[PDB]
Write a protein that binds this ligand. Structure first.
Ligand SMILES: O=C(O)CNC(=O)C(=O)O
Ligand SMILES: [Mg+2]
Ligand code: NI
Ligand SMILES: [Zn+2]
Length: 331
């Protein structure tokens, strides 16, 4: 078995190897990459997502989110308070302000220490889930707005034709902006490209150990657990590496820098934070190996997680029994 310790793998495709997306994903899995839950892909040196970022300030963040924390430094929840709309230009200025900017630090490790020590005492502002793309239409390789769609994968593998579309989303982050512990909708893959700015640190639990994380989460957030049988789908809970180590949960960490892709694999729980002002683009995708994870994916039926038009069809076809009760939570 390849990659038996479930380490995060880093790949350096040639421009020749960067032409066929599906084939490269299947290559990485041949080498065991999926066992970690997360992989890094460094694009060929000749490749570019676009010519420059010089004119992005006019993108609108219609609902910036202030991420308010509650709990203790290593075990907290976050709630997203909606703020007034601002442009990317206004957001970048805010991120660079004395109140919100990255503090002085020695290296990524000192900064990680400062994040876990101090996150709860601040409320950084996140521009999340903004439909759109920053890839130039002329970028033919690994363009997240030109991937084959999950609906087309389900059609090719299973023969069924369903409604829905699959498009990317932009994320604008600042120091301390945080993504809570989660897997993707329907335990899909994701791919995330860091277009510009400061790094993003990731934590990930191997898929084969995801239930260990869930059992810890039920112990640490007991009333959330009683309220919903899949409350990590609400994307509100954080658990530090120190706490994970104290409770024997297998995990890994890695820092993504500007110009790099990350792939998350089905049922790979992940969480993380941003080091300073940045812009990432991400989209879900599927492969044939995903289908069985889609069938087995947990769902939020308490009604908090409240998910897409396109996820409806996935639930209807892959989880017909749940269909019913799940759409009661989503209506
Ligand atoms: O970048 C972020 O804020 C969150 N991204 C992801 O969870 C992802 O790409 O799966
Ligand atoms: Mg613009
Ligand atoms: Ni994710
Ligand atoms: Zn729920």
């Amino acid at each position: 078995a390849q990659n038996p310790n479930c380490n995060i793998m880093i790949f350096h495709p040639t421009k020749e190897e960067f032409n066929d997306f599906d084939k490269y994903i299947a290559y990485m899995e041949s080498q065991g990459a999926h066992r970690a839950g997360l992989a890094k892909i460094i694009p060929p040196k000749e490749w570019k997502a676009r010519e420059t970022y010089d004119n992005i300030s006019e993108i609108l963040i219609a609902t910036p989110l202030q991420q308010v924390a509650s709990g203790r430094a290593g075990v907290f929840t976050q709630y997203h308070k909606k703020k007034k709309a601002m442009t990317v230009g206004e957001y970048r200025h805010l991120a660079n302000s004395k109140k919100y900017q990255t503090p002085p630090h020695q290296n990524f490790e000192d900064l990680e220490r400062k994040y876990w020590k101090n996150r709860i005492y601040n409320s950084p502002i996140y521009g999340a889930d903004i439909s759109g793309s920053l890839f130039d239409e002329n970028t033919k390789q690994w363009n997240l707005g030109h991937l084959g769609t999950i609906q087309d994968l389900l059609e090719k593998e299973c023969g069924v034709v369903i409604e829905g579309v699959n498009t990317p989303y932009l994320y604008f982050g600042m120091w301390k902006t945080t993504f809570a512990w989660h897997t993707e909708d329907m335990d899909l893959y994701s791919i995330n490209y860091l277009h510009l700015g400061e790094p993003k640190t990731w934590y990930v639990v191997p898929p084969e150990h995801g239930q260990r994380l869930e059992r810890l989460a039920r112990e640490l957030f007991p009333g959330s657990s009683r309220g919903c049988g899949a409350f990590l789908r609400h994307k509100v809970a954080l658990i530090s590496p120190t706490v994970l180590k104290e409770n024997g949960i297998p995990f890994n960490r890695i820092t993504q820098e500007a110009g790099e892709f990350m792939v998350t694999f089905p049922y790979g729980y992940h969480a993380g934070f941003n080091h300073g002002f940045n812009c990432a683009e991400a989209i879900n995708f599927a492969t044939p190996r995903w289908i069985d994870y889609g069938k087995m994916a947990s769902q939020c039926s308490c009604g908090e997680a409240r998910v897409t038009f396109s996820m409806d069809a996935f639930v209807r076809i892959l989880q017909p029994e749940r269909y019913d009760l799940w759409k009661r939570g989503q209506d």
